[PDB]
């Protein structure tokens, strides 16, 4: 998260860290949507052009709080599910993946799932100028001279970003964007700033329903041409537009 700030303890208890097992390395963000189900970006797991191809056994996830007793929870994955029509070849359309835990996770003060939206919620929020929240352990700067400058965070970072109108999204980039993704961030005019960055991919874009005070995951941190560049915006997988596929996977397995 570029230009964000430190999250408080328990502020984002659906947060999940995706780790490669060997060598141990933070890879991506994720979100807890049930006791056994975890949501992430497909490109975290599968990007052939870069030789990224992981299977359940290559990965573990980390959930909960990160002297103090270590209350963080490590778990393995049963199965990965990349969307069948995930377009890694062209534009990262349908950038979504599901991961089932080997054994279910026990909720606590630090571990709790986030709501997936329904038609009314997605339509009612998820409009331009409305702000969502992004969280991750990804980099603080797009580039940094190693050993002279801080780039990786010590606590979970948070930033609130406004959804951008689709026409502004389309015009900001040469990438062919689809109804399966939206963009967020401040315009150069707007004074404020902030963005996702490398390592924030797969984590959640959440909004608080004023109607029931619950947090909904509206987006998944997907892609961006840089981090926090003027005139440019981060793109998010449109979760509701892909909910039918989320249902299909959970209800069948």
């Amino acid at each position: 998260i570029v230009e964000g700030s430190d999250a408080e303890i328990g502020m984002s208890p659906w947060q999940v860290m995706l780790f490669r097992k060997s060598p141990q390395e933070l890879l991506c963000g994720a979100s807890l949507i049930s006791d056994r189900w975890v949501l992430t970006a497909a490109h975290c797991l599968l990007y052939p052009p870069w030789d990224k191809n992981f299977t359940e056994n290559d990965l573990l996830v980390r959930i909960g709080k990160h002297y103090e007793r270590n209350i963080e929870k490590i778990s393995m994955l049963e199965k990965i599910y990349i969307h069948p029509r995930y377009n890694w070849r062209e534009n990262l359309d349908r950038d979504i993946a599901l991961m089932k835990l080997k054994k279910p996770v026990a909720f606590s003060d630090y571990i709790h799932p986030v709501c997936l939206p329904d038609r009314e919620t997605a339509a009612s929020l998820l409009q331009a100028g409305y702000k969502g929240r992004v969280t991750g352990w990804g980099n603080l700067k797009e580039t940094w001279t190693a050993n002279v400058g801080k780039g990786q965070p010590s606590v979970l970072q948070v930033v609130n970003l406004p959804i951008v109108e689709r026409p502004v999204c389309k015009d900001s980039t040469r990438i062919r964007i689809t109804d399966n993704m939206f963009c967020a961030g401040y315009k150069p005019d707007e004074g404020k700033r902030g963005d996702a960055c490398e390592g924030d991919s797969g984590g959640p874009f959440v909004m608080k329903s004023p109607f029931n005070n619950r947090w909904y995951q509206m987006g998944i941190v997907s892609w961006g041409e840089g981090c926090d560049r003027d005139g440019k915006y981060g793109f998010y997988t449109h979760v509701f537009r892909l909910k039918k596929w989320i249902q299909k996977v959970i209800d069948q397995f």
Partner: peptide, 28 residues
Amino acid sequence: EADCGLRPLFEKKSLEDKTERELLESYI
């Protein structure tokens, strides 16, 4: 899940995180 998106250390205790009002204020 029936209790999803309600955070034990915030909504369940009637506490607000530092920056959430900024989200609500954006809906106005």
